[PDB]
Amino acid sequence: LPRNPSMTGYEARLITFGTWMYSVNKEQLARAGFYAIGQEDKVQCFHCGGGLANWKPKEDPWEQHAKWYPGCKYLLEEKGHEYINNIHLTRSLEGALVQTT
Amino acid sequence: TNLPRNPSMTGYEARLITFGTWMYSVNKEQLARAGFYAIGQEDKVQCFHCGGGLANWKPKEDPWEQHAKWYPGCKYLLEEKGHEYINNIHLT
């Protein structure tokens, strides 16, 4: 189950960025499962609870989500095993999380 | 033992970055690969999965071997290394 069920919806997450003054596009962040917590550009995934900060221009929210939190169930369901494996330049069994590389 | 104690440390990079200012000799990449992440007390590290903590490392010890020696019940250790590896460490 997601850490913050009240943020399961896209719109619910989108509204948290209010007027977003930071690097990355808020729509992309929200689509990637992130919502702003009210501390600089800090965001957290509604599902795995993984937090991310100090975003740089042109970064891809889905890519950062997969890089730092490969164990996220939302990431898995939306993007799939191959996407996650490619991000980590690797491959695994059809029942293994990328937790070693 | 079933679900990871600290799911936010499931990824290799997430664990590795906790060693950004690691001031000890024991290799940080090896520690991170072995499921460990630094917490900040002495040279204490903790497994993201079993929660097992380890400290007072020797400059050239093997984190996977120490993981198996002290926390043979760890599910991450089992899934990555397998039963035979764990048994060999304990000479069984």
């Binding site: 957290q44 993984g50 900060a53 100090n54 730092w68 | 997430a14 970055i17």
Partner: peptide
């Protein structure tokens, strides 16, 4: 980006 980096983890919080």
């Amino acid at each position: 980006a980096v983890p919080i």
